[PDB]
């Protein structure tokens, strides 16, 4: 399968520089050009530029001519994009896509801020008689007090996706974020199934697995 995997620092200081990466797999990296597209949440898409993983030729958008610098690494089959003199306007999601934009990566989020990162605390939202409905029970995890976004939340290592609602994070007056992730499961098997929320916050090196159990 053709796969583009982006990655890189998600929290960076203003005036600094950050280098994003795109690891390609499932196809001859050097046979297709690579594009980098920018997107500010809720806003439009922007073409930053492209590169030929074979020659090294680059074609930038006049707009990011001085902001971005694309490069590649044949040995590792990965393309890179470096952004300089970062400002709040560089905070956005960045994607890498094949020449024909038929394949896109998942995207990397960048938050330009001088504020320091803060890892989240993960508390269980335990299932109980007050979180019951028509034979189903809602349970989940509260991920609070973290900076910056995003924080990824999976249930049972991705084996539990149905009935899951991971809410948009809210901003607390302190400037820190909080979010909740819930899921509705059968009330009958609360005693035999195990539910664990896997929380990951890259900027703070946070990796938590919190088992959620009935209130007793």
């Amino acid at each position: 399968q053709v796969q583009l995997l982006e990655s890189g620092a998600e929290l960076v200081k203003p005036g600094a520089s950050v280098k994003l990466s795109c690891k390609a797999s499932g196809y001859t990296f050097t046979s297709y050009w690579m594009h980098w597209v920018k997107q500010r949440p809720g806003r439009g898409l922007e073409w930053i530029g492209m590169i030929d993983p074979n020659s090294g030729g680059t074609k930038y958008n006049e707009k990011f001519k001085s902001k971005a610098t694309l490069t590649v690494d044949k040995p590792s089959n990965t393309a890179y994009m470096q952004l300089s003199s970062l400002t709040s306007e560089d905070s956005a999601v960045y994607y890498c896509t094949r020449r024909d934009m038929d394949y896109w990566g998942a995207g990397t989020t960048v938050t330009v801020s001088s504020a320091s990162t803060k890892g989240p605390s993960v508390f269980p939202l335990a299932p109980s008689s007050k979180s019951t409905s028509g034979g189903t029970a809602a349970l989940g995890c509260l991920v609070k007090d973290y900076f910056p976004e995003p924080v990824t939340v999976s249930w049972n290592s991705g084996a539990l996706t149905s009935g899951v609602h991971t809410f948009p994070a809210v901003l607390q007056s302190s400037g820190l974020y909080s979010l909740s992730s819930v899921v509705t499961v059968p009330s009958s098997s609360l005693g035999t199934q195990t539910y664990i929320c896997n929380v990951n916050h890259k900027p703070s090196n946070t990796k938590v697995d919190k088992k959620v159990e009935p209130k007793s």
Partner: protein, 213 residues
């Protein structure tokens, strides 16, 4: 730079209805025009290219057309899973340009919310803070009101909420409200209630608890 003016910005349709989006080129793009579909939380996905060609896998429901400067994307039997943001793109000249985008929302039948409430965890309490969470699951329309009441006193300034994007399967929404107090203030009361108001309810629904276990 050859801009693509895309309309409408937003659209509300019902399953089965026909939807059409338009992109007018600033200059003139023969046929190098593409359309992408971006579902919530996902990355753009190639839908149409060359103005009328459909990328592999893309269902016949999607059809593109237009030439010269005016282009349109048409989705016939509008399905639930088709809710998303759509973008047109010009790739005839550099720099590559994208239309402003159109958010296609689905209109469906009224669905009242299911309400759940979660007291603070012991782990959090031992940390000196108490957060109470109220969940409003799978309702429609998106508009809903939540009011926190402690010992029957309406709260203000101590809660935050967020609403999900529309669900691609049942076209409903869900909402989460968090009432955060200090472990101290939380212990000066016994009744924590979440009062919900919504179009699918004939009168306010209240979910609450005291402080057992």
């Amino acid at each position: 730079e050859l801009v693509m003016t895309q309309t409408p910005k937003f659209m509300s349709t019902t399953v089965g209805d026909r939807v059409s989006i338009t992109c007018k080129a600033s200059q003139n793009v023969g046929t190098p025009v593409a359309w992408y579909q971006q579902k919530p939380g996902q990355s753009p996905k190639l839908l149409i290219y060359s103005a009328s060609n459909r990328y592999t896998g893309v269902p016949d429901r999607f059809t593109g057309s237009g030439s010269g400067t005016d282009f349109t994307l048409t989705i016939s039997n509008m399905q639930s899973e088709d809710l998303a943001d759509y973008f047109c793109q010009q790739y005839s000249s550099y720099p590559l340009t994208f239309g402003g985008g159109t958010k296609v929302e689905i209109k469906r039948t009224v669905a009242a919310p299911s309400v759940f409430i979660f007291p603070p965890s012991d782990e959090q309490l031992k940390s000196g803070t108490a957060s109470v969470v109220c969940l409003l699951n799978n309702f429609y329309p998106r508009e809903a009101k939540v009011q926190w009441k402690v010992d029957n006193a309406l709260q203000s300034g101590n809660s935050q909420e967020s609403v999900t994007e529309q669900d691609s399967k049942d076209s409903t929404y869900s909402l989460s409200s968090t009432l955060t107090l200090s472990k101290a203030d939380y212990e000066k009361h016994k009744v924590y209630a979440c009062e919900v108001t919504h179009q699918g309810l004939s009168s306010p629904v209240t979910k609450s608890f005291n402080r057992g276990e």
